[PDB]
Amino acid sequence: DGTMTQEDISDYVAANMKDAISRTSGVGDVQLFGSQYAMRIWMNPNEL
Amino acid sequence: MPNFFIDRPIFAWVIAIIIMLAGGLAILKLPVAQYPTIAPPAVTISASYPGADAKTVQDTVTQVIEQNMNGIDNLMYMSSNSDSTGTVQITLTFESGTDADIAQVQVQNKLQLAMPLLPQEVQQQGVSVEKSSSSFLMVVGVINTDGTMTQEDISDYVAANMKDAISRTSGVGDVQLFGSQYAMRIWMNPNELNKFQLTPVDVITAIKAQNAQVAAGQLGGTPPVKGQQLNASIIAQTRLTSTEEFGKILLKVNQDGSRVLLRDVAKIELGGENYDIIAEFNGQPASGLGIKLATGANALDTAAAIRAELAKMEPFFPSGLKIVYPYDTTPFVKISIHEVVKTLVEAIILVFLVMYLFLQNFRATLIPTIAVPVVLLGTFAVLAAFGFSINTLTMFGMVLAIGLLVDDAIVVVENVERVMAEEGLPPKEATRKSMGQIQGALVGIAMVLSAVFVPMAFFGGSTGAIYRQFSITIVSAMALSVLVALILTPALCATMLKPIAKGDHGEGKKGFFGWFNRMFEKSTHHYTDSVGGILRSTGRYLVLYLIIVVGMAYLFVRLPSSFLPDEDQGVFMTMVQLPAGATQERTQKVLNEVTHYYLTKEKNNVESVFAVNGFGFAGRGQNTGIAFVSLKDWADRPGEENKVEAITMRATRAFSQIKDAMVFAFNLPAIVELGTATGFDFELIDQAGLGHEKLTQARNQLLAEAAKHPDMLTSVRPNGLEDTPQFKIDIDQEKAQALGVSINDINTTLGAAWGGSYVNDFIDRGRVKKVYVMSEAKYRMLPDDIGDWYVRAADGQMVPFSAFSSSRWEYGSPRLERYNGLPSMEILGQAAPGKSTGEAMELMEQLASKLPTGVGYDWTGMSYQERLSGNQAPSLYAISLIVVFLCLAALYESWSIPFSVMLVVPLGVIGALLAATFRGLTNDVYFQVGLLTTIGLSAKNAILIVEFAKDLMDKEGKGLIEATLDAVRMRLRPILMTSLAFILGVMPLVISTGAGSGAQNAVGTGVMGGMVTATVLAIFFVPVFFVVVRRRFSRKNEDIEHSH
């Protein structure tokens, strides 16, 4: 529906689905194809 | 085999004797327990963040560990509490049958990935991973009878001299100290600190520097110079050992050379690492150890090892110190098992008496009597072979087995008798011909009987492990009984039986027997006379049979069903929960009331009370407590009113009138793991980052709605705590920067003063213990005290907290719950009277669907399994019926004749249902197994009756009615001998009072009623079943009378 970018989706999956799946019966390891969000501080060396 | 051993009695004896030795040896080594283990293993991770609030614990420790919990085998669910005591507990619950050692290894492998991400202060408190039951196995209390040690003294003694060895003992899963080990306490005074321009930061630095243990090398150490003569260790600073030494720690020297010592800015004393837990025993100062059993360990063995270790400590106690025993779950196990043993012995005695009444000869009665203990002992050997324990269920299996065993011996011994009476053949020759004619049937019967007891070995889940104990015990015993009947009994008949002369029936005797024997011979002709009559009638009796069936059906659907009875185990607990925000002093006042009640209003029932302030199943908190209560022996507590159920009910009622507290006494269930036979355990879940406040609102909405369906739901309530006022302090970054005060100094001053800080270790009387710095109590009681704490700025100026902070009141949680890694709130409740757990749960689900967006739910604990699903009964007894039919068809080489045996089934059930309905009993485990036994026996009786009739009609040429009557008359006596021996044998059970009498009563009364109706109803009905079935399913060829 055009409301979430790829990175949004990856955060949603990381933060709401992956942990439970990885604790599900018979599941051995789970690889995220993407990345959970972090707070990103993108520094500017000139302003620094 | 029979012929072989008839000529070799000594060989027969040798086999019996070796079987008994094997059994006796098993009994000496076999584990003893109340029940087989059915609890899901649970691994618990525990951590502590001194001075942290619940949210700080959750967001800094609990979430971090939880996110690392993955790829763990057999995990059913995970739950956690993070509380404002600074404590986290994370519980991982595993599938039944999971190896707890591996579960623990797998949990810790994941925990170690989280460990480095935890605050240093949390890592230094020690995180632990344990595998233990949730309940206490026992509490070992410690008091001082000379009153020469305070509560704090005793607690330190226990912590320092007793706790570690107990914690190392195999089978001990977890040990809780009810009190605290001493630490060196440095109680800081902000006024003095500010006066000397010092802060808690300087205090901590000085303690680390001056309470140090330094490695300093050696004189003449390797590699040395050539010619070296001296080698000695260099000893520099060592840990401080006393308050005197800590007091002279040098904080600084003034400009004028005067000294500032630690004792100048602090009070210094030995005192607890914490001050949250305070216990009393019968109102006096005490400490103690609350011990939990490691997963799967044997309760009795572990308790014995604990006592053995305690006994090693006693001789070195300081004067007056004494161990007391306020709460132990294990004595009841030992005692209840021993009462079942007594009934076994008693049962064998009664069997001996009934045998005599009929056999009238010491040596003869001895045969069926020897057979029982031989088979029973062998059965223990088989249990060992299969890795079973001696438990309540295997023991009742033995008791129930006696009916089957004694009947085997009786059938064998009686049949020989009848033979020596019907022919005057001598003993050796008679047992031969006898064994020749029944031996085939004994073996076949054991087969059809296994068809009634095996199916129950296949019940599913937790239920199943219980029924399996019986199944295997009873089947094994029956198999051994056939063996013994084929080896020992024939040998014994042939050597120990008295020659009976053709025609003799004991009427020649004078005295009671002569009289008895005459009455029976007579009453027998009267029996046959009656059947002969009934067989000319009938039609009417099929109609009576249908009455009994419908009646049976009526009683069945009306008899409520349960699982295992609650027993009075001579102990119980009382929970005390005040609102969060409540003080330790208020909790003590409520505990005093609880103690007072047991000490004064339950004098005749209660032996002791061990009450603990600051610990509950929470655990820790100022607003919680628990009392462990031990009752006097069952024998001094005669009557319903003096048993645990009525005591706990009266207590709860008295305690309901305690202001602003929830206090209730309750009896533990047979199996917690199973829970409250009616309860549900519900988890409300934040599925969408909603947050605590919104989850609370959803919870409240759900509670309100549930409060409107009293017709279905009762006592639907939260398991956790309500939000409480908290003091929010905002540090002003800009002001701090302006004044040159570091945020680290601010936070350490605030935290150390108001929360306390574990600095490093010291040595107290040879034992490593902790050093804590914290504000003296009077400077951390009031909000205004905050501004009395000063921090030193870079430019050396002392700056009060009030200069760089502001504060406000708000509300927050003292305890945050998570379930499967999501924020949660647990809700307890139960089905309203008349309503089924399923119904209540369905409704909880409906209401849950009406909740705000983002709120979900789950079922846990007792409600988890459970769906799962129920009622396997119909299916399994269905196949049981079918297999029984098939077995009988093989035995009789007929598809129709088996019905003449199977129609007896209802006749024992009816009496069982009647007697149980009458005594107010339930359709529970004990009712069911006893019924199978009763059914087994009446089946066996019917099988031997129609076997005899059929043979008569087949070998001889006897016609239908004649054969039925001769069959029924030959079988009356053996049937009566067995019925009476067994009904009397279970008398001790229905009559039982005392330890485990709930179980005993439940077993006994079902059997007694069943056997009574089975016996009286079968001896008339079976002949009916037979002729009615022989007609209906024949083929024009009689029913004379023919031959040959």
Ligand SMILES: CCCCCCCCCCCCO[C@@H]1O[C@H](CO)[C@@H](O[C@H]2O[C@H](CO)[C@@H](O)[C@H](O)[C@H]2O)[C@H](O)[C@H]1O
């Ligand atoms: C006709 C014979 C009847 C008894 C035959 C005995 C055969 C072998 C018994 C050994 C096993 C245990 O036997 C029995 O155990 C229990 C448990 O402590 C004791 O029975 C109990 O007596 C009172 C009341 O009944 C209890 O409150 C107490 O806890 C316990 O001592 C009995 O005193 C003991 O006889």
Ligand SMILES: CCCCCCCCCCCCO[C@@H]1O[C@H](CO)[C@@H](O[C@H]2O[C@H](CO)[C@@H](O)[C@H](O)[C@H]2O)[C@H](O)[C@H]1O
């Ligand atoms: C009619 C015959 C058939 C019925 C008999 C059934 C008896 C049932 C017994 C169940 C309870 C017995 O429990 C068990 O008893 C023995 C008796 O000392 C104990 O065994 C212990 O005592 C003896 C010494 O006296 C030692 O050989 C042994 O090393 C020690 O462990 C077990 O540790 C205990 O677990």
Ligand SMILES: CCCCCCCCCCCCO[C@@H]1O[C@H](CO)[C@@H](O[C@H]2O[C@H](CO)[C@@H](O)[C@H](O)[C@H]2O)[C@H](O)[C@H]1O
């Ligand atoms: C492979 C998996 C399943 C295993 C099969 C299940 C077995 C079920 C059998 C149960 C009943 C067996 O019972 C057995 O029946 C036969 C046949 O009547 C009997 O045999 C005896 O009685 C019959 C009839 O009176 C005689 O014809 C026969 O000569 C005699 O030996 C046995 O004395 C008895 O022990």
Ligand SMILES: CCCCCCCCCCCCO[C@@H]1O[C@H](CO)[C@@H](O[C@H]2O[C@H](CO)[C@@H](O)[C@H](O)[C@H]2O)[C@H](O)[C@H]1O
């Ligand atoms: C021909 C030879 C053999 C004939 C069979 C004769 C046996 C007759 C009695 C069997 C027991 C019947 O009783 C039945 O037991 C089951 C559980 O075991 C009960 O089941 C109920 O309680 C249990 C509690 O643990 C639940 O798990 C279950 O989901 C629920 O429906 C039934 O409420 C009851 O009706």
Ligand SMILES: CCCCCCCCCC
């Ligand atoms: C342990 C009991 C020993 C029994 C001896 C049997 C005596 C019978 C000899 C024929």
Ligand SMILES: CCCCCCCC
């Ligand atoms: C289990 C039903 C068996 C039916 C047998 C009928 C024989 C004529």
Ligand SMILES: CCCCCCCC
């Ligand atoms: C289980 C089916 C048995 C059916 C036997 C029928 C005999 C005619």
Ligand SMILES: CCCCCC
């Ligand atoms: C369930 C009845 C309890 C009494 C046992 C001592």
